[PDB]
Amino acid sequence: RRARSAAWSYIFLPEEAWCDLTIHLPSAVLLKEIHIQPHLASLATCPSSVTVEVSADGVNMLPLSTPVVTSGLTYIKIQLVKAEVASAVCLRLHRPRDASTLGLSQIKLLGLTAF
Amino acid sequence: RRARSAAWSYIFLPEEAWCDLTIHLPSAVLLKEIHIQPHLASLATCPSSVTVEVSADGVNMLPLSTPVVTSGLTYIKIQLVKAEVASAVCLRLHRPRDASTLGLSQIKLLGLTAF
């Protein structure tokens, strides 16, 4: 807490409105919750809206729902009502409403494997 | 900048969702823009939505429009299309979306007097 430096910072072009982060798990697991941690020192760099793309095959992303508004949140916790298999998870992050830089502290993919 | 302490901090009760700040000008002036500065060190304490109540008589508040969403903004600038007389300005500030404390740095009422 109060690290004052973003772990990952993205610079937005003026034409660009969505930044993609794609996580390829080594094997397909059941996915229940996804936790995204914005930068606590500056919530101006927090994304305005985050939609979540998952893929059971890992190459064809069939996402989950509408984009969730994440403005003014110290911690983004996205929880699935239905747990679904996902060998790859892609995250489209919108441009922040005021700042032009995207600040993320940590991305967590919580779930269970079989066997 | 980076003062790390809010100039004014409000503690929210769990039942309370709106906090009112009422500014009584000594004389009625034309009002064009209202500038509200949230706490720059922590935008978790920034209000989620701010509606603006003005009053020409100063005792009967006839507000201006729907509440403006202010989540994730380093600076709240509210500008009137039509300048209206206002001897008193009241500001209802919503509870922040994540934090339970309201952090404001400065409130500015920009306008013109006659004569």
Coordinates of C-alpha atoms in Angstrom, one line a residue:
Chain A
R1 CA 0.0 0.0 0.0
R2 CA 1.1 3.6 -0.9
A3 CA 3.7 2.3 -3.3
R4 CA 3.3 5.6 -5.3
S5 CA 4.5 3.9 -8.6
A6 CA 2.2 1.8 -10.9
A7 CA 3.3 -1.8 -11.5
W8 CA 2.2 -1.5 -15.1
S9 CA 1.5 1.8 -16.9
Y10 CA -0.1 2.1 -20.3
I11 CA 0.0 5.3 -22.4
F12 CA -3.1 5.9 -24.4
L13 CA -3.1 7.3 -27.9
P14 CA -5.9 9.9 -28.6
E15 CA -7.7 7.5 -31.0
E16 CA -7.3 4.5 -28.7
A17 CA -10.1 3.9 -26.2
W18 CA -9.6 0.2 -25.2
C19 CA -6.4 -1.5 -24.0
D20 CA -6.3 -5.3 -24.0
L21 CA -4.5 -7.6 -21.6
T22 CA -4.5 -11.3 -22.5
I23 CA -3.6 -14.0 -20.0
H24 CA -3.1 -17.5 -21.3
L25 CA -3.4 -20.1 -18.6
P26 CA -1.3 -23.3 -19.3
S27 CA -4.4 -25.5 -18.8
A28 CA -8.2 -24.9 -18.9
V29 CA -9.5 -24.3 -15.4
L30 CA -12.9 -23.4 -13.9
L31 CA -13.0 -19.7 -13.4
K32 CA -15.1 -18.1 -10.6
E33 CA -13.8 -14.7 -9.6
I34 CA -11.4 -12.2 -11.3
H35 CA -9.7 -9.6 -9.1
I36 CA -8.1 -6.5 -10.6
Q37 CA -6.3 -4.1 -8.3
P38 CA -6.0 -0.5 -9.5
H39 CA -3.2 1.8 -8.4
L40 CA -4.0 2.9 -4.8
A41 CA -1.9 6.1 -4.8
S42 CA -3.8 7.6 -7.8
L43 CA -7.3 6.5 -8.7
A44 CA -7.2 8.8 -11.7
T45 CA -5.3 6.0 -13.5
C46 CA -8.1 3.5 -12.6
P47 CA -10.0 2.3 -15.7
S48 CA -13.5 3.7 -16.3
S49 CA -15.0 0.4 -17.5
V50 CA -13.6 -3.2 -17.7
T51 CA -15.2 -6.0 -19.7
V52 CA -13.9 -9.6 -19.4
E53 CA -13.2 -11.9 -22.3
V54 CA -12.8 -15.6 -21.6
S55 CA -12.1 -18.6 -23.9
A56 CA -12.5 -22.3 -23.3
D57 CA -10.5 -23.1 -26.4
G58 CA -8.1 -20.2 -25.7
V59 CA -8.1 -18.6 -29.2
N60 CA -11.7 -17.6 -29.7
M61 CA -12.7 -15.2 -26.9
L62 CA -16.4 -15.5 -26.0
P63 CA -16.8 -12.8 -23.2
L64 CA -19.1 -12.9 -20.2
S65 CA -21.3 -9.8 -19.9
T66 CA -21.6 -6.1 -20.5
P67 CA -18.7 -3.8 -19.4
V68 CA -18.7 -3.2 -15.6
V69 CA -18.2 0.5 -14.5
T70 CA -15.1 0.6 -12.4
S71 CA -14.7 4.4 -11.9
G72 CA -13.7 5.4 -8.3
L73 CA -13.0 1.8 -7.0
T74 CA -10.0 1.0 -4.9
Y75 CA -10.5 -2.7 -5.8
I76 CA -12.2 -4.3 -8.8
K77 CA -13.8 -7.7 -7.9
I78 CA -15.6 -9.4 -10.8
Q79 CA -17.5 -12.5 -9.7
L80 CA -19.2 -15.0 -12.0
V81 CA -22.7 -16.3 -11.1
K82 CA -21.9 -19.3 -13.3
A83 CA -18.4 -20.8 -13.2
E84 CA -17.1 -21.4 -16.7
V85 CA -14.0 -23.0 -18.1
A86 CA -11.4 -20.6 -19.5
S87 CA -8.0 -21.6 -20.8
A88 CA -7.3 -17.9 -21.7
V89 CA -8.7 -14.7 -20.2
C90 CA -8.6 -11.4 -22.1
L91 CA -9.3 -8.0 -20.4
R92 CA -10.3 -4.9 -22.4
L93 CA -9.7 -1.9 -20.2
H94 CA -11.2 1.5 -21.1
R95 CA -9.4 4.8 -21.0
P96 CA -9.7 6.5 -17.6
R97 CA -12.2 9.3 -17.5
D98 CA -9.7 12.1 -16.6
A99 CA -6.1 10.7 -16.7
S100 CA -4.5 9.5 -19.9
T101 CA -2.5 6.7 -18.3
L102 CA -3.7 3.3 -17.1
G103 CA -2.5 2.2 -13.7
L104 CA -2.8 -1.4 -12.5
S105 CA -1.3 -2.9 -9.4
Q106 CA -2.2 -6.6 -9.7
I107 CA -4.5 -8.9 -11.7
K108 CA -5.8 -12.1 -10.1
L109 CA -7.6 -15.0 -11.7
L110 CA -9.3 -17.0 -9.0
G111 CA -10.7 -20.4 -9.7
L112 CA -10.5 -24.2 -9.4
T113 CA -8.9 -26.8 -11.6
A114 CA -10.3 -30.3 -11.9
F115 CA -8.3 -33.4 -11.0
Chain B
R1 CA -0.8 19.4 -5.0
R2 CA -0.1 16.2 -3.0
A3 CA -1.1 17.8 0.3
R4 CA -2.1 14.2 1.5
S5 CA -4.7 15.6 3.9
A6 CA -8.3 16.6 3.0
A7 CA -9.2 20.3 3.6
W8 CA -12.7 19.1 4.7
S9 CA -13.6 15.5 5.5
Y10 CA -17.2 14.3 6.1
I11 CA -18.0 11.0 7.8
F12 CA -21.0 9.2 6.4
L13 CA -23.5 7.3 8.4
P14 CA -24.7 4.1 6.8
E15 CA -28.3 5.4 6.4
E16 CA -27.0 8.7 4.9
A17 CA -26.4 8.9 1.2
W18 CA -26.3 12.7 0.5
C19 CA -24.3 15.4 2.3
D20 CA -25.3 19.0 1.8
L21 CA -23.0 22.1 1.6
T22 CA -24.8 25.4 1.5
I23 CA -23.0 28.6 0.5
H24 CA -24.8 31.9 1.2
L25 CA -23.4 34.7 -1.0
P26 CA -23.8 38.2 0.6
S27 CA -25.6 39.5 -2.5
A28 CA -27.2 37.9 -5.5
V29 CA -24.8 37.6 -8.4
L30 CA -25.0 36.0 -11.9
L31 CA -23.6 32.5 -11.7
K32 CA -21.9 30.9 -14.7
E33 CA -19.5 28.1 -13.5
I34 CA -19.0 26.2 -10.3
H35 CA -15.7 24.5 -9.7
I36 CA -15.3 21.7 -7.1
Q37 CA -11.9 20.3 -6.4
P38 CA -11.7 16.8 -4.9
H39 CA -8.8 15.5 -2.9
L40 CA -6.0 14.8 -5.3
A41 CA -4.1 12.4 -3.1
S42 CA -7.1 10.0 -2.7
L43 CA -9.8 10.0 -5.4
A44 CA -11.6 7.3 -3.4
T45 CA -13.0 10.1 -1.3
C46 CA -14.2 11.9 -4.4
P47 CA -18.1 12.1 -4.6
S48 CA -19.8 9.8 -7.0
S49 CA -22.5 12.3 -8.1
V50 CA -23.0 16.0 -7.4
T51 CA -26.2 17.9 -8.0
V52 CA -26.3 21.7 -7.7
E53 CA -29.0 23.7 -5.9
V54 CA -29.2 27.5 -6.5
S55 CA -31.6 30.1 -5.1
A56 CA -32.3 33.6 -6.3
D57 CA -34.1 34.4 -3.1
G58 CA -31.6 32.4 -1.1
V59 CA -34.0 30.4 1.0
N60 CA -36.0 28.4 -1.6
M61 CA -33.5 26.3 -3.5
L62 CA -34.5 25.6 -7.1
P63 CA -31.7 23.5 -8.5
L64 CA -30.3 23.3 -12.0
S65 CA -30.3 19.9 -13.6
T66 CA -29.9 16.1 -13.0
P67 CA -27.0 15.0 -10.8
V68 CA -23.7 14.9 -12.7
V69 CA -21.6 11.8 -12.3
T70 CA -18.2 12.8 -10.8
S71 CA -16.6 9.4 -10.2
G72 CA -12.9 9.3 -11.1
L73 CA -12.4 13.0 -11.8
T74 CA -9.5 15.0 -10.5
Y75 CA -11.4 18.3 -11.0
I76 CA -15.2 18.8 -11.1
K77 CA -16.1 21.8 -13.4
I78 CA -19.8 22.4 -13.6
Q79 CA -20.7 25.0 -16.2
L80 CA -24.1 26.6 -16.9
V81 CA -25.4 27.0 -20.4
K82 CA -27.7 29.8 -19.1
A83 CA -26.3 32.1 -16.4
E84 CA -28.8 32.5 -13.6
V85 CA -28.9 34.7 -10.5
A86 CA -28.1 32.9 -7.2
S87 CA -27.9 34.5 -3.8
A88 CA -27.3 31.1 -2.2
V89 CA -25.8 27.9 -3.7
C90 CA -26.4 24.5 -2.1
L91 CA -24.4 21.4 -3.1
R92 CA -25.7 17.8 -2.4
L93 CA -22.8 15.4 -2.6
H94 CA -23.4 11.7 -2.8
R95 CA -21.5 9.1 -0.8
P96 CA -18.3 7.9 -2.6
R97 CA -18.7 4.6 -4.4
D98 CA -16.0 2.8 -2.4
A99 CA -14.8 5.0 0.5
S100 CA -17.0 6.1 3.3
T101 CA -15.4 9.6 3.7
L102 CA -15.9 12.7 1.5
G103 CA -12.8 14.6 0.6
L104 CA -13.0 18.1 -0.8
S105 CA -10.0 20.4 -1.5
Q106 CA -11.7 23.6 -2.6
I107 CA -15.1 24.9 -3.8
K108 CA -15.3 27.8 -6.2
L109 CA -18.3 29.8 -7.3
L110 CA -17.4 31.7 -10.5
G111 CA -19.6 34.4 -11.8
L112 CA -20.3 38.0 -12.4
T113 CA -22.1 40.7 -10.3
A114 CA -24.0 43.6 -11.9
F115 CA -23.1 47.2 -11.1

